[PDB]
Amino acid sequence: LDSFKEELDDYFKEKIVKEFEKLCKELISKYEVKKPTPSPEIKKICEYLKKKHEELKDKYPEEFVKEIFKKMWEVFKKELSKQLKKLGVTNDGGEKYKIVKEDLNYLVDVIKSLEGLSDLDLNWEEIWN
């Protein structure tokens, strides 16, 4: 059934996001802005996303994978936003900012190099707002 596949699609979506949401809550809340870049927590998030994409590619259409990786991107930005305010890191041209910017470029490259995700809107500048 149509009506019902849509309901379960959203159910599996919600749970795929929650699983990543608790990963990020656990890693980003202990993220500290220091070299070496990429940071271990960023790498861990990168390996989870490389793992989940290949596993999701097997079994969902192109459009659904992109929607899930949009939501995970949103969830990551919101978690990183609150950790950066906890630390006092702002977009002020300093080394703490550049370190965050290297980590995030590394992350966005990873996500964009996944098949079907290269055109995702992966801007992050609102994490400072």
Numbering used by the authors: 3 to 131
Paper text:
Given the failure of side chain grafting to produce epitope scaffolds that engage the CC40.8 mAb, we employed an alternative design technique, termed backbone grafting. Here, rather than transplanting only the epitope-specific residues onto a preexisting scaffold backbone which is otherwise unchanged, an entire region of the parent scaffold backbone is replaced with the backbone of the secondary structure containing the desired epitope. This allows the grafting of more complex epitopes that have no existing structural match, such as the CC40.8 S2-helix epitope. Next, we optimized the sequence of the S2hlx-Ex designs using ProteinMPNN21, a recently described deep learning algorithm that takes a protein structure as input and generates amino acid sequences that are predicted to generate the same fold. Analysis of a high-resolution (2.3 Å) crystal structure of unbound S2hlx-Ex19 further confirmed the successful transplantation of the CC40.8 mAb epitope. As expected, the grafted epitope region in S2hlx-Ex19 diverged considerably from the backbone region it replaced in the parent scaffold (backbone RMSD = 5.8 Å), with the epitope adopting a more exposed conformation that allows for antibody engagement. This conformational change was likely facilitated by introducing two aromatic residues (Tyr62 and Phe66) under the epitope helix, which effectively pushed the epitope segment away from the rest of the protein core. Interestingly, the epitope conformation on S2hlx-Ex19 was almost identical to that present on the prefusion stem helix, rather than the more extended one induced by CC40.8. Nevertheless, given the high affinity of S2hlx-Ex19 for CC40.8 (KD = 6.7 nM), it is likely that the antibody can readily induce the necessary conformation upon binding. Interestingly, the stem helix immunogen S2hlx-Ex19, which bound with affinities for CC40.8 and S2P6 similar to those of the native spike, displays the epitope at the N-terminus of the scaffold.
